[PDB]
Amino acid sequence: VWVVGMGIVMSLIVLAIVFGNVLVITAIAKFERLQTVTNYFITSLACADLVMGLAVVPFGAAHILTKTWTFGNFWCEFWTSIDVLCVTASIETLCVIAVDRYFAITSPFKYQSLLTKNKARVIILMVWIVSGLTSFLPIQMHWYRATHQEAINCYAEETCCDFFTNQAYAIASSIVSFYVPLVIMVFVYSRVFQEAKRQLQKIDKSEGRHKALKTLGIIMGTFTLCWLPFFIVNIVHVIQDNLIRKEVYILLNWIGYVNSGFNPLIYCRSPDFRIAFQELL
Numbered sequence: 001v002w003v004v005g006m007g008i009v010m011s012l013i014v015l016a017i018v019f020g021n022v023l024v025i026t027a028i029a030k031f032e033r034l035q036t037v038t039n040y041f042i043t044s045l046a047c048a049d050l051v052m053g054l055a056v057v058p059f060g061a062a063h064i065l066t067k068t069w070t071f072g073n074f075w076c077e078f079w080t081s082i083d084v085l086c087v088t089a090s091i092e093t094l095c096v097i098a099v100d101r102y103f104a105i106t107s108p109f110k111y112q113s114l115l116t117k118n119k120a121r122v123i124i125l126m127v128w129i130v131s132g133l134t135s136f137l138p139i140q141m142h143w144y145r146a147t148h149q150e151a152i153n154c155y156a157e158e159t160c161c162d163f164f165t166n167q168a169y170a171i172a173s174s175i176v177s178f179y180v181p182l183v184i185m186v187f188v189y190s191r192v193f194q195e196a197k198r199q200l201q202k203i204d205k206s207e208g209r210h211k212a213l214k215t216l217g218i219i220m221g222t223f224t225l226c227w228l229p230f231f232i233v234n235i236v237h238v239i240q241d242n243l244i245r246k247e248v249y250i251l252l253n254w255i256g257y258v259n260s261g262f263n264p265l266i267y268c269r270s271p272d273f274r275i276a277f278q279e280l281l
């Protein structure tokens with residue numbers, strides 16, 4: 001009396017993610033005015049989220065629902081690699097956008113000289129290649145496989161494949177994916193908020209007759225609430241053998257996936273985007 005209900009929520013999540021990302025992608029391609037040098041990063045993030053919603057989630061829901069990985073044994077290694085790729089690429093693209101904002105605010109005159117049209121392609125390719133090296137190469141040739149007797153059967157068994165990692169791959173993946181981008185974004189947005197406050201205070205000197213806090217709160221709260229617990233539990237269950245159950249890990253991992261669906265609403269609400277959305281439909 002519970003199988004049908006949860007599948008409805010899963011289908012709504014999948015449909016929402018796919019619809020949002022497809023609309024965001026088609027908006028930029030359709031209209032010339034929406035195109036911008038900075039908007040290519042949004043295109044990359046939208047592509048990553050669309051790939052996640054097209055591949056990772058629908059297959060991962062079947063494992064939860066039917067409780068049997070009825071697909072082939074070779075496929076789920078590819079599935080895990082795709083999941084890691086789709087997480088790392090999105091997080092690093094968000095970090096790139098934050099750094100772009102810092103350059104835009106803290107250096108007006110020199111902003112054009114630093115960033116040009118062609119540099120965006122190089123940055124995107126570097127981000128995606130770094131995402132590829134951390135996921136496909138270790139997963140496919142099996143550095144990550146654990147040595148303890150448990151789960152060796154599941155690696156051998158065709159019906160089973162669950163994530164199990166040594167004490168090194170978890171640390172390396174967590175450091176590459178989460179902590180460094182978090183530090184970079186924190187410092188960048190701290191400086192941006194300081195500059196905005198300085199200007200807001202300066203105006204009141206010559207005008208003798210809030211918004212930044214709200215927007216920064218939204219941007220940091222969404223990302224931190226989405227992704228902070230997952231990497232903490234990822235580190236902790238590997239530092240000590242038994243402190244975390246599997247169900248909690250699965251729940252936190254699935255909560256982490258909803259972020260890719262919220263990105264279009266967070267980052268695409270400018271008047272030009274609204275006009276484009278109205279024009280499309």
Ligand SMILES: CN[C@@H]1CCc2c(ccc(O)c2O)[C@H]1O
Nearest residue numbers: 080083084087163173174177253
């Ligand atoms: C199947 N779930 C995986 C497991 C570990 C992991 C994920 C995402 C990014 C990483 O850097 C990871 O190490 C999760 O999506």
